[PDB]
Design a binder for this molecule. Structure first.
Ligand SMILES: Cc1nc2ccc(Cl)cc2c(-c2ccccc2)c1C(=O)O
Ligand SMILES: Cc1nc2ccc(Cl)cc2c(-c2ccccc2)c1C(=O)O
Ligand SMILES: Cc1nc2ccc(Cl)cc2c(-c2ccccc2)c1C(=O)O
Length: 135
């Protein structure tokens, strides 16, 4: 859509809250958390007609997903969960839902003041990750 166009580009992490707690909630062990916490990853968001691609680049792990809005797709996460995923658009918010093993976690991205804010939720664990556009 025209709402999606605003997310397009290269984004760099400049701040983080509760990410270690989030990973813990998912079951990521201390050793891996220490490593993933330390990194300051870059996320590339691109569009190719109907297909959105989302790339994360970092020393900890590189991941890439492509998908169409509203169409369920399989995903292997950075922490190696095999999940059923679906990305929707609620107004300004790009809402990513992952299901697996009777569990659910949401990854919401919205634009606020030219910054991309990613909110990762799993149960009581709520993580806020702030990105600045590189352009
Ligand atoms: C994050 C953490 N770190 C710990 C380190 C050491 C020990 Cl012994 C326990 C914990 C626990 C914990 C888990 C179940 C019952 C009670 C505590 C937790 C927790 O996630 O709740
Ligand atoms: C190092 C350690 N020691 C523990 C001792 C006891 C219990 Cl119950 C839990 C832990 C945990 C833990 C593992 C996953 C999620 C949450 C906590 C850890 C940790 O890997 O971070
Ligand atoms: C969205 C997401 N979900 C995750 C869930 C669990 C773990 Cl362990 C890592 C991630 C990561 C990630 C964080 C740092 C470097 C690389 C990837 C990301 C990501 O920002 O791309």
């Amino acid at each position: 859509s025209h709402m999606v166009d605003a997310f397009l580009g290269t984004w760099k992490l400049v701040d983080s809250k509760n990410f270690d707690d989030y990973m813990k909630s998912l079951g990521v062990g201390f050793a891996t958390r220490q490593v993933a916490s330390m990194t300051k990853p870059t996320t590339i968001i691109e569009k190719n007609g109907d297909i959105l691609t989302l790339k994360t680049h970092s020393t900890f792990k590189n991941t890439e997903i492509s998908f169409k809005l509203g169409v369920e797709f399989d995903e292997t996460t950075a922490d190696d969960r095999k999940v059923k995923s679906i990305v929707t658009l609620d107004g300004g918010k790009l809402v990513h839902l992952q299901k697996w093993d009777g569990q659910e976690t949401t990854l919401v991205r919205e634009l606020i003041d030219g910054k991309l804010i990613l909110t990762l939720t799993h149960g009581t664990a709520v993580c806020t990750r702030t990105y600045e556009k590189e352009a």
